[PDB]
Design an enzyme around this catalytic site. Structure first.
Site, PDB file in Angstrom:
ATOM      1  N   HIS A  41       0.838  -1.188   0.000  1.00  0.00           N
ATOM      2  CA  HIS A  41       0.000   0.000   0.000  1.00  0.00           C
ATOM      3  C   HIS A  41       0.874   1.239   0.000  1.00  0.00           C
ATOM      4  CE1 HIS A  41      -2.513  -3.216   1.594  1.00  0.00           C
ATOM      5  NE2 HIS A  41      -3.561  -2.527   1.178  1.00  0.00           N
ATOM      6  N   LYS A  44      -0.943  -7.762  -5.035  1.00  0.00           N
ATOM      7  CA  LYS A  44      -1.849  -6.654  -4.739  1.00  0.00           C
ATOM      8  C   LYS A  44      -1.075  -5.362  -4.502  1.00  0.00           C
ATOM      9  CE  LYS A  44      -5.236  -4.704  -1.764  1.00  0.00           C
ATOM     10  NZ  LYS A  44      -5.563  -4.600  -0.331  1.00  0.00           N
ATOM     11  N   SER A  98     -24.030  12.601 -15.689  1.00  0.00           N
ATOM     12  CA  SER A  98     -23.688  12.042 -16.996  1.00  0.00           C
ATOM     13  C   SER A  98     -23.344  10.556 -16.936  1.00  0.00           C
ATOM     14  CB  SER A  98     -22.526  12.824 -17.622  1.00  0.00           C
ATOM     15  OG  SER A  98     -22.922  14.100 -18.083  1.00  0.00           O
ATOM     16  N   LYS A 136     -14.168  23.766 -20.639  1.00  0.00           N
ATOM     17  CA  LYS A 136     -14.833  23.884 -21.936  1.00  0.00           C
ATOM     18  C   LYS A 136     -13.976  24.660 -22.935  1.00  0.00           C
ATOM     19  CE  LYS A 136     -19.561  23.870 -19.957  1.00  0.00           C
ATOM     20  NZ  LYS A 136     -20.174  22.645 -20.528  1.00  0.00           N
ATOM     21  N   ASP A 177     -24.138  22.406 -25.709  1.00  0.00           N
ATOM     22  CA  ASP A 177     -24.743  23.291 -24.715  1.00  0.00           C
ATOM     23  C   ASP A 177     -25.719  24.258 -25.363  1.00  0.00           C
ATOM     24  OD1 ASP A 177     -23.646  22.575 -22.075  1.00  0.00           O
ATOM     25  OD2 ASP A 177     -21.738  23.348 -22.826  1.00  0.00           O
ATOM     26  N   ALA A 193     -19.817  33.910 -17.866  1.00  0.00           N
ATOM     27  CA  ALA A 193     -19.227  34.066 -19.187  1.00  0.00           C
ATOM     28  C   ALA A 193     -18.150  33.017 -19.414  1.00  0.00           C
ATOM     29  CB  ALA A 193     -18.661  35.471 -19.380  1.00  0.00           C
ATOM     30  N   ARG A 249     -15.722  40.285 -18.739  1.00  0.00           N
ATOM     31  CA  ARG A 249     -16.295  39.258 -19.598  1.00  0.00           C
ATOM     32  C   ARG A 249     -17.755  39.575 -19.941  1.00  0.00           C
ATOM     33  NH1 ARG A 249     -13.516  39.744 -21.056  1.00  0.00           N
ATOM     34  NH2 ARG A 249     -11.966  40.870 -19.840  1.00  0.00           N
ATOM     35  N   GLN A 289     -28.821  18.233 -23.876  1.00  0.00           N
ATOM     36  CA  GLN A 289     -27.439  18.201 -24.336  1.00  0.00           C
ATOM     37  C   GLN A 289     -26.847  16.806 -24.247  1.00  0.00           C
ATOM     38  OE1 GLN A 289     -24.219  17.803 -22.634  1.00  0.00           O
ATOM     39  NE2 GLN A 289     -25.365  16.960 -20.897  1.00  0.00           N
TER      40      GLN A 289
END
Ligand SMILES: O=C(O)C1=C[C@@H](O)[C@@H](O)[C@H](O)C1
Length: 498
Positions: free
Chosen positions: A125, A152, A249, A296, A334, A353, A380, A464
């Site tokens: 570990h 492991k 999602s 994005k 979108d 924005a 913005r 979307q």
């Protein structure tokens, strides 16, 4: 390497009788085996309690007696600790887990004394990081040299790119390997074991009974992530975001993939750095992604080709990796999801924005009324590139207009955060909130009390999403299905996948 991954449930109840009931619940939920965490028992009578668990467990048993020096609870004499594991073996354990540190000595102690069905897991570990492939290789070889039946290795996710190294290890090591990466950024390592050769994954009886950070529940592995359907050829999709744990999602796309028998799986992708993420997961195994806050705009830059709508929006929320050349194509769903949800609700004030604000701002100037943006940072641009308003001023502001939140304000756990004062809503006829977790934000609640029309983020989210399915699969968007999936499987609130 070999069989699909088993699902093992950690059993940590502090009393023998409660562990018995936990093994039963493990069986009911679908787990393949149980890990009996002996170091968590408050009063332990080894010969007696061990006999009880092996007799009563409906599932194969893996006994672990974890010492404090390996992250466990057990303190005290080391030979007595080992005596217990050997006792578990000779009483009929299906496996024991023994720490790499003492594994050579211990396996020597049972040489020529192992029952037939019995396998020894030797584990290591790492609570700090995920070492290089070179260092992992040496770890594997050291564990093999003790005479382990199964290797492991648990490591720690500093960045999500760490997981690729663990997949490389489980996929190519020629020895049964349990290889897992702990922490939220490692969660993908726990889901995809059956594609990359992992022998076993841990799934919890419920989210309170976590034995190491990041473990999902058994129910989510089976019913949300469709664990039994994952195989070497399954293509991987996911929601790139930060934060990402709220996203539904994975709920909708996995249900849709399963419904249409498409060989894909959709996971959460907690991404700190978008460039290094895409570079680290460029193989054909990773066929497409959704892109959320705050990635994005950076995704648009990382894409090789860009759809015109996304080009002219300035932001990408869907990435497809073209099988031909491995090329990354960028789309935006979108805009249509936002605008069409608003039109079905029936001068535009757009909060935020970022990428989602760009897509909504862009869409609105295109059809009906071209109007004004409001962002945290006043300056913005976008109100110019489309035809502004500082955030601190937006309350101070017609009678029956529109307002569209596209920021994270109000998203769980910030359930009492709202982008605008209740009194300022009197000037608005429709209020749209892209936040869908929770379904009823403070903004939407107060907007309805203000008598206005409320369109929730789920209307945008489902729209979307089935457009991304179409992009992802090349199959016609099954709109009715996605509504039905969201209604039946995406209704519960305060869900964190992490
Ligand atoms: O919460 C989510 O999973 C997402 C929300 C929106 O930003 C969408 O643009 C994104 O594609 C998926």
């Amino acid at each position: 390497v070999k069989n699909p991954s088993l699902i093992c449930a950690p059993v940590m109840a502090d009393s023998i009788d409660k562990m018995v009931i936990e093994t039963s619940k493990a069986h009911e939920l679908g787990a393949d085996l149980v890990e009996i965490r002996l170091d968590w028992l408050k009063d332990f009578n080894p010969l007696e309690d061990l006999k009880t668990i092996i007799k009563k467990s409906p599932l194969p048993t893996l006994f672990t007696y974890r010492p404090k020096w390996e992250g466990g609870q057990y303190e005290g004499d080391e030979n007595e600790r080992r005596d217990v594991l050997r006792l578990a073996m000779e009483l009929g354990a299906d496996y024991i887990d023994v720490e790499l540190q003492v594994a050579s000595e211990f396996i020597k102690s049972i040489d020529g004394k192992k029952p037939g069905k019995f396998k020894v897991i030797v584990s290591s570990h790492n609570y700090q990081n995920t070492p290089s492939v070179e260092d992992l290789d040496g770890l594997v070889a050291r564990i093999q040299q003790t005479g382990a039946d199964i290797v492991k290795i648990a490591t720690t996710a500093v960045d999500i790119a760490d997981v690729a190294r663990m997949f490389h290890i489980t996929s190519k090591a020629q020895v049964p390997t349990i290889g897992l990466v702990m922490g939220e950024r490692g969660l993908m390592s726990r889901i995809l074991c059956s594609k990359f050769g992992g022998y076993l994954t841990f799934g919890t009886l419920d989210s309170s009974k976590v034995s190491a950070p990041g473990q999902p529940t058994i129910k989510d592995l089976l019913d949300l992530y469709n664990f039994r359907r994952i195989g070497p050829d399954t293509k991987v999709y996911g929601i790139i975001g930060k934060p990402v744990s709220h996203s539904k999602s994975p709920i909708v796309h996995n249900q849709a993939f399963k419904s249409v028998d498409f060989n894909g799986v959709y996971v959460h992708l907690l991404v700190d750095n978008l460039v290094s993420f895409l570079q680290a997961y460029s193989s054909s195994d990773f066929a497409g992604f959704s892109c959320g806050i705050p990635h994005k705009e950076a995704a648009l830059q990382c894409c090789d080709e860009v759809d015109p709508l996304a080009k002219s929006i300035g932001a990408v929320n869907t990435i497809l990796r073209r099988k031909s050349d491995g090329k990354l194509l960028g789309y935006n769903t979108d805009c249509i999801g936002s605008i069409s949800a608003i039109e079905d609700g029936l001068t535009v004030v757009v909060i935020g924005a970022g990428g989602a604000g760009k897509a909504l701002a862009y869409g609105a100037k295109e059809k009906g009324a071209k109007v004004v943006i409001a962002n945290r940072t006043y300056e913005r641009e976008l109100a110019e590139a489309i035809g502004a308003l500082s955030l601190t001023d937006l309350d101070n502001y017609e009678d029956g207009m529109v307002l569209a939140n596209t920021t994270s304000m109000g998203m769980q756990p910030n359930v009492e955060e709202t982008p605008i004062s209740k009194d300022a809503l009197k000037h608005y006829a429709l209020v749209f909130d892209a936040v869908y977790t929770p379904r009823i934000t403070r903004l939407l609640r107060e907007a309805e009390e203000s008598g206005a029309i409320t369109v929730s983020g789920s209307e945008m989210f489902v729209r979307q999403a089935y457009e991304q399915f179409e992009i992802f699969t090349g199959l016609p968007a099954p709109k009715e299905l996605y509504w039905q999936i969201m209604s039946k499987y995406g209704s519960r609130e305060n869900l964190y996948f992490q």
